[PDB]
DNA sequence: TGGTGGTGGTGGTGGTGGTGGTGGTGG
């Protein structure tokens with residue numbers, strides 16, 4: 001009755017007096033709580049994510065074995081970010097970026113902030129400082145397996161430092177979660193894989209840096225290499241596979257496959273033809289691919305060349321599949 | 326055969342009671 005209304009009013013008034021405006025409000029009328037996303041550059045993955053892109057303000061996680069293609073996909077993301085007009089930062093903790101290849105993929109070197117730190121504490125301080133400013137929209141840490149605590153860099157090569165990196169990461173998560181969301185900035189951790197001894201059942205694969213990062217993420221993705229793409233005998237690229245092993249903004253466990261060629265990277269148009277054929281928009285007959293009663297190409301490669309050479313029909317195919325899916 | 330009329334402050338004593346746990350790594 002009226003008593004409850006008065007009690008709620010007084011409580012909310014006191015709260016918002018003590019801690020400021022916006023502290024307590026109904027959920028439906030708050031626009032800060034909405035989810036928004038940006039593209040990963042691959043249609044298959046951007047549909048597997050469900051919401052069409054990676055979430056802004058959150059923490060994403062990517063890991064795989066050696067030569068799986070992590071930095072490549074992250075550079076594609078950063079590329080799409082600038083192309084829409086958004087600043088970016090790239091923290092290379094492993095000291096292994098090569099500016100040229102980045103230029104090849106599409107990132108504007110004149111605008112991509114960069115840093116090669118020497119200790120994990122310095123890296124995460126830089127992350128906090130950049131995020132808190134409201135000036136950097138995308139941040140990337142090249143490998144969480146290289147963020148060494150201070151005490152171990154100055155120690156001997158046999159000094160055990162049990163569990164220090166886990167403590168570092170657990171503190172860092174607590175600190176960042178709030179500022180990332182306040183500023184609307186996306187942070188991507190990239191991780192490696194180490195096997196575990198003593199497992200009696202199940203897989204032995206694990207990632208580095210403790211259990212903290214797993215709880216705090218909204219998205220986690222596997223990435224694996226599954227085959228080679230050949231031109232004649234000459235190897236030209238790699239075939240991949242991805243699983244959304246964790247999700248918090250859409251139904252999880254879907255997949256995505258695509259080609260990485262050593263040139264531009266993600267073969268957008270191969271993916272588009274595959275989607276068109278799968279959703280039955282592009283016609284096919286035996287080994288011959290067709291379109292609206294006209295024969296397109298007698299193979300994947302030639303058909304893709306056809307699509308690339310034919311901007312007029314490619315955009316129709318695109319928008320149709322996009323709107324359908 | 327007959328009584329008058331009030332002055333002026335001085336010096337401090339004594340101590341109580343502690344609260345709380347972080348973080349795995351390598352075939």
Ligand SMILES: Nc1ncnc2c1ncn2[C@@H]1O[C@H](COP(=O)(O)OP(=O)(O)OP(O)(O)=S)[C@@H](O)[C@H]1O
Nearest residue numbers: 064065066067068069070071072096098101238262
């Ligand atoms: N500058 C380059 N030029 C040509 N091919 C490259 C170049 N850099 C990477 N590649 C290829 O892309 C694949 C490796 O992708 P990466 O970006 O290194 O992802 P990664 O899984 O982190 O591998 P790491 O960092 O060496 S463990 C390999 O097929 C490389 O041959």
Ligand SMILES: [Mg+2]
Nearest residue numbers: 069070071072
């Ligand atoms: Mg890399």
